[model samples]
Target: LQPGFSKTLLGTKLEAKYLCSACRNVLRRPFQAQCGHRYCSFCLASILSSGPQNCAACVHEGIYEEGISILESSSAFPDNAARREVESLPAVCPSDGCTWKGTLKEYESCHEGRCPLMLLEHH
Candidate 1:
């Protein structure tokens, strides 16, 4: 089995792929903080400005309490290039089994309005 970031394997350290748990988009050459959370530098900065200090996934809260640690040599990660290429492609919606492919812009549009597979809040 391939070693995932959650644990080490056979004396080999496994690197965490910085991915957005919500969107599954791999964050390119991300930065980490003392709280053990990772995020794309640009994305994190954007989110931080919006006033949420919690880990987007686990909602650990108080992100400002931790400082950032940039990940250098991130290019050394295996399949990093390939993953980036795939990530750039149109992605299907995460709502149930919806199978739509388009740019993130297009995906967001459809996901917002007309995704039949999506579960509505009040439905």
Candidate 2:
């Protein structure tokens, strides 16, 4: 920690590491492999073209087939309560130099509608 520095934790934040290992984003259309590693739906297909992907974390021959169902039809592995947590999490405002931080659900709207920094750019 640095003087006047503030940060968050796993309990407070859900950063990129918490999401896809391939793209480093918050699990967009998230998909999980048999190795318990998660990746974005687009990433998984882009990451391993063949079968049995070797997870960088485990280095094991297990990432499921290329045709694994991404829908909640197989809910136990990749569905339940993952994406909502990512969407519900808060983030710093994208407005440059703005201190406003809020849930992702409201982040964009806040910047466009209410952020002082953003409002000034309307001219």
Candidate 3:
């Protein structure tokens, strides 16, 4: 996913800890950097594929010193705690006129693109 779940569909506002450093949405398959910043797995993996880069979160916060390079391949690891937290977050379908609602997990694994209302509109 290019971005994580949309904030407008979340039942509650997310703290910074639950947001992806790169995508700026709620983390999906969260990973944590050595700097304690979190990113979505896809977000970090894409960055890693392009070689090491400064952590977006750190850069945004002005936490990195000049020329300090944080090797993303070495720093980023699966953050299961964040994964669990993200999965459990409450959410609703973003599709117009859809009444479906569920935990974030269900929304991703089940209801997201499969919403009946969304399918109806694809015609």
Clashes of each: 0, 0, 0
* Pairs with backbone N, CA or C atoms under 3 Å apart (clashes), candidate 3: none
Q: Which pairs clash (backbone N, Cα, C closer than 3 Å) in model 1?
A: none
RMSD of 1: 11.6
- Give candidate 2's total backbone clashes: 0
Model 3 CA lDDT for position 103: 91
Write down the TM-score of every candidate. Answer: 0.31, 0.49, 0.85
**Candidates arranged by TM-score, highest first:** 3, 2, 1
lDDT: which is higher, 2 or 3?
3
Candidate 1 residue-wise lDDT, 1-123, digit = tens = 111111211012223344533233444334454345555555555555655454554443434332232222321123445435434445455455556555434544445357666555553
Worst 10 residues of 3 by lDDT: 65-74
Give me the runs in candidate 2 sitting further than 4 Å from their true place: 1-17, 49-52, 60-80, 95-101, 106-123
lDDT of all the models against the reference? 0.41, 0.51, 0.78
lDDT value, residue 78 of candidate 3: 90
C-alpha positional error of residue 123 in candidate 1 after TM-score superposition, expressed in Å:
43
- Name model 3 segments beyond 4 Å from true: 65-71
